[PDB]
Amino acid sequence: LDYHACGGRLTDDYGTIFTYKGPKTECVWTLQVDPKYKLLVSIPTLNLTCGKEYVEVLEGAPGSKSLGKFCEGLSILNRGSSGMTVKYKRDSGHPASPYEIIFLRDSQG
Amino acid sequence: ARINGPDECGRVIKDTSGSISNTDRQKNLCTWTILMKPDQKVRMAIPYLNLACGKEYVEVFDGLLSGPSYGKLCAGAAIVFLSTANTMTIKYNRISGNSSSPFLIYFYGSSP
């Protein structure tokens, strides 16, 4: 399903997170999946205002190991486990740029 | 819900969301057309595709089988598609063979 809220614990086989347009400057989405499977996170063609905003991928819950922070990138692909979090942050006074993050339960059948 | 690929060939799926499993026992030709409410667009993703290229391929059409093709594919990860209307067709085709390369197709209605 499609998500437009500022963060939350999402459980979905195929989810697409879109730009949250509300007043909060930081949103953190924790992705859950049946632990028997791994999560595939895809952030294709990212184009944010470097310096004013970024998307950060964490190994687990907030405070866990940060895998990377980015504002641009043709393709960023990650495979993680349930509990993995995607975080978006922007500076006050900077309107959020359009983004789209895709998470999928990685399976072949 | 979870559709068993082979059982649904040639039919129109009306589920707001679900998954289609190809299975390793698919027909040589199988087509599925997803139909959503008129106000919706279909979002589809294949988490992992590794078909025996040269023998198999999957093709997605924006609309029915006569609609614009997104192209034939045989491999990939996080393959995503968005239709322009409330209908989307997926076609699995295998040139010769008995076995099929398994894969999952997730889908859901995206109402803007």
From Swiss-Prot, chain A:
Keywords, in A-Z order: Disulfide bond, Glycoprotein, Secreted, Signal
Glycosylation sites: 47
One GO term (biological process): single fertilization
Disulfide partners: 6-27, 50-71
Similarity comment: family membership: Belongs to the spermadhesin family.
Purpose of the protein: Not yet identified, major porcine seminal plasma protein. Can bind soybean trypsin inhibitor after deglycosylation.
Protein name, UniProt field: Major seminal plasma glycoprotein PSP-I
Phylogenetic classification of the source organism: Eukaryota, Metazoa, Chordata, Craniata, Vertebrata
Curated annotation (Swiss-Prot), chain B:
The keyword Signal is annotated on this UniProt entry: yes
Gene Ontology biological-process annotations: single fertilization
UniProt subcellular location: Secreted
Expression across tissues: Seminal plasma or sperm.
UniProt keyword annotation of Disulfide bond present: yes
Keywords: Disulfide bond, Glycoprotein, Secreted, Signal
Main subcellular localisation: secreted
Glycosylation site list: 98
Domain CUB as annotated: residue spans: 9-110
CC terms in the record's Gene Ontology section: extracellular region
Annotated S-S bridges: 9-30, 53-74
Subunit structure: Monomer or heterodimer with PSP-I (depending on the type of glycosylation of PSP-I).
Family, as annotated: Belongs to the spermadhesin family.
Protein name: Major seminal plasma glycoprotein PSP-II
Organism per entry: Sus scrofa
Residue numbers of the full-length protein present here: 22 to 133 of 137
